[PDB]
Each structure stands twice: as C-alpha cells, then as structure tokens.
Design a protein around this nucleic acid. Sequence first.
DNA 1: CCGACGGAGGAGCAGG
DNA 2: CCTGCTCCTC
DNA 3: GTCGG
Length: 325
Amino acid sequence: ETLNGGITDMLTELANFEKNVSQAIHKYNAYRKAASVIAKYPHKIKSGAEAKKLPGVGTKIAEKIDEFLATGKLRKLEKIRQDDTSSSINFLTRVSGIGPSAARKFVDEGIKTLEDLRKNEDKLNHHQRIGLKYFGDFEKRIPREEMLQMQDIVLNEVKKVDSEYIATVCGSFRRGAESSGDMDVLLTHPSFTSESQPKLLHQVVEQLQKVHFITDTLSKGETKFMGVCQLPSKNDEKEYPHRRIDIRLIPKDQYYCGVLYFTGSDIFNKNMRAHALEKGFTINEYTIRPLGVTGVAGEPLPVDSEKDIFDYIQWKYREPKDRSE
DNA sequence: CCGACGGAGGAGCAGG
DNA sequence: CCTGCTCCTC
DNA sequence: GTCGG
Ligand code: NA
Ligand code: NA
C-alpha cells in the first residue's frame, strides 16, 4: 500500500477539486506539493503537528490530517463527493480537451456523463471528440516494454525520412521507469537553429501516419505536434490500446537543454538550476546563460550535449537513471 | 502581512 | 492578412 | 494553501 496513502489520497482528491471545480490552480499545486512530500516521508504520521514540520504542509492541512486520523474521513471531502455538480465537473475533466471551463459549461447545460457527451457530439470540438473516443485507453499506463517498441518505430521511421534528424524519447521513460503515462519525443535538425527546410516536423508526422503508427491529431503546428499512436497488432494477439504522443521540434542549439528539461525529474530540475545559481548561471528549458555582475543574464552558452550543461556549472554528469531528484 | 506560485504552442475565438 | 485573448495541455 | 521575504 503506502505508509500514509490514506492521507495522500485525501490530499490528491482535494487537489483535483481545487483544480477542476474551484479553478484554484495554486491550491491544486499546494495540495499536490503536500501529497508529494508526505508520500516521501518515511514514517507514519501520528498527528497533524507531525506533518506540519514538513515543507509544504501548513495550518489547514495539519488540521485536516488531525481529523482524518481521528475519524478516518474528511467531511469537506464527504460533502464534495455527494454534491452531484462538483463531481460531474470533476469527472468530465478526465476527457482530453475538457478542462475546468468546458466541464462546468457542459454540466450547466445538462451534460454530466460520457453518454451525455456521445449524445452531444455537435457541442464537442475535435480534440474533445478524440479524447472521448479514447477515454478508456488514455487512462491506461504504458508498460516499459511497450515504450521500447514505440521508441524503436519512432527513431527507425525518423531515420528513414532523414539520417540527420535527432530524436530523443524523454520523460520518466528515459530515467528508466517501469511505465509511462505517454510518449514525449524531442526532435531537431541541423538546418533549424535559433538564427534561422520549412516542413521539418510535418514530414516526420506524415511518415508516422503513413505506416499507420499515428492515428489521430489533437493539435499540430510548425514546432509542436500532439496526437495519438498505436502499436501494430502482432497478428497473433489482441490490438494494443491507443496512446498519447507529443513531438516537439526544437532548434539544435537549444536541443539538449530541452532534452535535459523534459527528462526531469521536476525535483532534479529544481535542484539543478538551484546549483546553477550559486555558481553564477541560469538555466531554463532553452539555454544556460551566465550571470551577470548586477544579476543580468548574458548570451546563451554553446551546448552540444547534456554533459556540457553539467560541466558549465561544475556538476558531475548524472545518468538519466540517477536523475529522480 | 502579502505577493508568488512555470509558462508557451496550438485551437478557437474576437477584432482590427 | 494580422495581433491578442482564454482554454487546454504537459 | 503554503512559503519566504
Ligand atoms: Na510546514
Ligand atoms: Na481534460
């Protein structure tokens, strides 16, 4: 199970409410931040005062923990769950393309279920229809061995379009995770820099649709594709679940800052650019830049690999498998 | 107290 | 044609 | 909702 999972489930459920119903994004991250640090906490919380010591748990969450520990539930949560409007709004946001704004409008005009969504196709946009059509699959995890094939098809199909493309599958997968939520692909080409072939991403997408790897399109422009993919059925067995795949085209001079940022983790990203500051550097997802007598960032530094970023700030290179914080 | 909390590409709209 | 807005995504 | 300044 998990030492404190009853508490972290309570917080995560509260986070979804603030995000989906209240439209309080910062409260959503507050509950998420508290849920994270408590999931890492290697003891089993016996009081709200104990949890309040941790960074991210404050007065209000400590009192809710005192109540959950004493009675086994949270009344704020109990009243929210039996409120039919709040929870229907919550549920509809699980459809890709339906955020908190669209979810409330739907529930306002009597639309509360997937069945209601299917009876009202006229009121959905293209993204929302694809999210509805694949509602079940998109909530399924991707086992690592399925990522490996998907990765193999992607890089192989990419190389066939041009040997000069470079593609890196990032996310938790690159750190060696047993499963992935989606597939996130970072693409670049030497002919695309910041001081700068006009269909570089389209040609790679075209090829993936042609071998019927990419099945649908959620959004697509010159630098960012968000769509749907599916592995080919072995022909002995049942077909695979449709999966989400994003493909970003990044200038070559910003590629490995991107690969590093979208590899993560978000904690490691936080710590890495923390260290960078103590050494006189600033890193975002695009560049690493020097500071800066008064604190002004200078011109981007040349980066040919991930290790160049580690070397500038004088950090020992760390494998993606060792970058979970 | 009191402001910050990641933030930009693309879809879909308004409007110049 | 263009910019600029919310919304959604990650 | 929480934190740091
Ligand atoms: Na605290
Ligand atoms: Na959604």
